[PDB]
């Protein structure tokens, strides 16, 4: 996932 990510979090989260 990408959730742990910061922008992909609002995106794909």
């Known amino acids: 996932g990408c959730c742990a990510n910061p ?4 995106k794909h989260c």
């Open 7 to 10: 922008v992909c979090n609002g």
